[PDB]
Each structure stands twice: as C-alpha cells, then as structure tokens.
Amino acid sequence: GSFVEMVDNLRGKSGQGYYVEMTVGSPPQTLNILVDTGSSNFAVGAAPHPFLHRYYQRQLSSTYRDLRKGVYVPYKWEGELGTDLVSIPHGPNVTVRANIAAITESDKFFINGSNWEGILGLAYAEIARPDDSLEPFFDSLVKQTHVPNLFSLQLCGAGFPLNQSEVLASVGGSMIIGGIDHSLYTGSLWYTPIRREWYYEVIIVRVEINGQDLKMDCKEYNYDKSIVDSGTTNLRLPKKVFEAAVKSIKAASSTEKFPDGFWLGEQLVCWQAGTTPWNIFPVISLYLMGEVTNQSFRITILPQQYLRPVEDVATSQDDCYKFAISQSSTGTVMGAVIMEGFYVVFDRARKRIGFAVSACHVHDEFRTAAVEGPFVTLDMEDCGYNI
Numbered sequence: 001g002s003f004v005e006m007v008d009n010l011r012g013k014s015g016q017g018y019y020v021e022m023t024v025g026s027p028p029q030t031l032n033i034l035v036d037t038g039s040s041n042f043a044v045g046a047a048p049h050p051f052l053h054r055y056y057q058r059q060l061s062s063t064y065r066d067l068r069k070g071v072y073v074p075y076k077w078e079g080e081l082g083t084d085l086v087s088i089p090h091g092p093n094v095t096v097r098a099n100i101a102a103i104t105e106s107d108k109f110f111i112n113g114s115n116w117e118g119i120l121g122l123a124y125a126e127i128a129r130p131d132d133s134l135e136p137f138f139d140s141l142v143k144q145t146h147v148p149n150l151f152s153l154q155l156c157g158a159g160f161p162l163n164q165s166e167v168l169a170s171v172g173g174s175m176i177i178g179g180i181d182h183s184l185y186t187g188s189l190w191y192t193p194i195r196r197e198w199y200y201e202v203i204i205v206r207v208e209i210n211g212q213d214l215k216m217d218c219k220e221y222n223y224d225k226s227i228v229d230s231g232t233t234n235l236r237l238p239k240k241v242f243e244a245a246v247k248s249i250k251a252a253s254s255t256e257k258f259p260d261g262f263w264l265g266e267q268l269v270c271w272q273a274g275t276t277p278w279n280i281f282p283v284i285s286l287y288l289m290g291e292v293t294n295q296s297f298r299i300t301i302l303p304q305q306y307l308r309p310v311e312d313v314a315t316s317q318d319d320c321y322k323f324a325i326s327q328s329s330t331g332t333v334m335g336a337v338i339m340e341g342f343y344v345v346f347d348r349a350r351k352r353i354g355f356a357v358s359a360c361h362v363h364d365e366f367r368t369a370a371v372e373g374p375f376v377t378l379d380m381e382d383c384g385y386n387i
C-alpha cells in the first residue's frame with residue numbers, strides 16, 4: 001500500500017452513502033462529502049437545513065467567487081454557482097480552485113443521520129448541470145496539479161447494522177486519489193472499457209446466477225446503459241433483466257419462501273442471530289467486456305453483498321436484511337452494494353474501469369467474491385445499446 005495517507009478516509013454505508021472529508025474556502029470550512037461516481041457536480045449545503053449541522057458560509061470565505069448563475073437539479077436541489085479553494089485533508093496534499101454549487105434549497109436530498117453535507121460528483125462534464133461548461137471537480141484537480149488522472153474506491157460494508165454512534169466511529173473504506181493502493185485488494189485487477197465518458201458506462205456481456213446463464217440477449221443487460229454508481233445503494237437492473245434475475249434467484253433459494261415485499265426490496269427478512277442461510281442464496285456473476293478483442297472477465301458477488309444489513313424494527317438480536325437488487329427504467333446501475341465486494345479503479349487516463357476482489361468484502365468460510373478471467377466472448381459490441 002503506497003497511499004497510506006488516503007487509506008481508510010471514507011465513512012458511511014450503502015444505504016446512506018460513503019463520504020470523504022473536504023474543506024472549502026479561506027479559512028477552510030470542513031464538510032463531509034458524499035462520493036458519487038454517478039453525477040458530476042460538487043454541491044454543498046450552503047444554508048440552514050433540518051438535517052445539516054453545518055454548511056458552507058460563503059460570506060466567511062475570502063476566496064469565494066460568485067459566478068452569478070443558478071443551477072437546478074431535479075432527481076431535488078437548487079443552488080448558486082461560484083468557485084472557491086478546495087482541499088481533501090486525507091487526500092493529495094494540494095489545494096485547487098473548483099466550481100461549487102452552494103445549495104440554498106433542497107427536497108429529499110439531505111438524509112437525516114447520513115452525516116454528509118454535500119456531494120462530490122466524480123463523473124464527466126457531459127452530465128454536469130447546468131451544462132458541460134461547468135468543469136467537474138476532478139477535472140479541475142488534474143488540470144491544476146500533478147495528480148494522476150485516476151482514482152480508486154474501496155467501499156466497505158460492515159456485514160451488519162451500524163447504529164448512529166458506530167457509523168461515525170467506523171472506517172467505511174478508501175478513496176485513493178491519483179493511484180492504486182495494493183493493500184486494498186487481493187488477486188488481480190481486471191479492466192473493462194469505459195464505453196463513453198459521461199457516466200462511468202460499461203458493457204455487461206453475460207449474467208449467471210449460480211453458474212446458470214440468465215440466457216438473455218446481452219443488449220438487454222445494457223438497456224439503455226450500464227453504469228458504476230457509488231451514489232446508488234442497490235444493484236439496479238433493467239425491468240426485463242430484473243424479472244428474469246429474481247425468478248432465478250427465487251428458484252435457487254426455493255428451500256425458503258420469502259414474501260413478495262422482500263423481493264420488491266421493501267421489507268426486511270430476519271433470522272435468529274448468526275443463522276442467516278447464506279448458502280441457500282446464489283452467487284451472481286456479471287461478465288464485463290475485456291480490454292482484449294473477444295475477451296471478457298467476470299465479477300462474482302455473494303448474497304453478503306446483495307442482502308443489505310438493516311436493523312430489526314424491534315432492534316432485537318436477529319440478523320435482518322433487505323433485498324438490494326431492484327428494477328430500473330434507466331439501465332443497469334452497479335450501486336454501492338455491488339461495489340462493496342470489489343476494489344474499483346476509475347482509470348480515466350486509460351478510459352477503463354478495473355475490478356479486483358476487495359480486501360474488505362464480507363463473506364463466509366465457504367464462498368468469496370471473485371474477479372476471474374479471461375473468457376472467450378464474441379460480438380460483445382452488439383451488447384451495447386444505441387438509442
């Protein structure tokens with residue numbers, strides 16, 4: 001591990017997001033910021049909010065610059081654009097001038113108890129609001145310093161419920177800015193092409209549930225796109241793929257019947273402490289386009305990744321979970337519960353995303369997550385969707 005200063009710099013969990021500490025302004029104002037690979041704006045609470053115990057105060061920053069322009073983002077948050085000096089305490093030892101959307105109004109954006117006060121959109125300018133002229137933070141970072149155009153994320157799910165006090169004292173993972181820390185993964189890194197630079201778009205070419213081919217036209221797996229998004233909790237799948245996957249996961253786990261509410265990701269299921277039947281649930285393998293023609297590799301996750309630990313409505317001693325795979329009308333989204341099984345390298349410089357088994361993924365004595373290759377796969381270009 002060559003990036004000790006950035007190792008263990010994240011806190012949080014899949015359901016509320018993972019955040020890194022940042023400072024904005026002069027003198028520096030400390031804020032917790034959601035790491036989001038699914039958006040492209042650096043936006044921070046800049047006014048009183050019931051769920052914020054701190055916010056960016058522009059009038060207190062001598063380096064604050066007003067852009068005299070508003071920004072509206074309906075998902076919703078509304079803000080005022082400006083620039084100011086930004087640093088990441090547990091990151092590269094550099095300070096950069098970056099765009100900052102000062103959030104003055106929001107609805108269902110700030111999560112009570114998440115402990116984050118802003119969001120760091122790490123994707124490309126193409127999806128930045130109001131438009132692509134608003135340079136994303138990471139672009140500014142790379143243009144203004146010698147930091148390599150690459151970052152890597154190790155998101156660490158605990159494998160169990162973290163109460164309010166625990167989630168604040170627990171290490172939630174690592175965001176390595178400008179490099180790859182070898183202590184964060186085991187085995188080899190396998191790279192899949194970033195199909196296009198907007199979201200971190202990838203192409204899935206095959207899906208297996210316990211080794212059984214879901215057998216769908218691979219274009220279905222990427223309809224209308226597949227992205228890697230730390231800002232989403234669940235593994236989200238295109239409606240038709242979701243229906244086929246749930247049918248297969250139910251069949252694999254058929255020795256136990258679960259209520260429709262469970263499969264809809266709305267209700268928790270509980271087992272007596274320590275008796276969660278991990279073994280009756282299937283592993284899920286996603287094959288991704290490789291860097292070599294006609295070559296693919298696969299990432300395999302366990303139910304320890306797709307069943308999200310949640311506290312029992314009775315706070316009892318049972319181990320309870322929610323099914324963290326859900327339907328999407330906007331394509332496949334490899335959310336936080338999937339990222340928790342792997343060390344994910346966002347190699348912007350080489351337009352590729354790398355995957356390796358995470359040193360912090362949750363597993364049991366019988367099965368582990370995996371990243372394996374190579375596999376001979378034909379016509380993978382046909383798996384991509386074109387509007």
Ligand SMILES: CC(C)C[C@@]1(C)NC(=N)N(Cc2cccc(Cl)c2)C1=O
Pocket residue numbers: 036037038039075109229230231232330
């Ligand atoms: C982290 C959230 C609160 C804020 C935001 C913008 N970031 C994010 N990754 N998503 C999920 C998403 C991805 C792609 C399209 C849409 Cl519409 C939403 C969001 O809604």
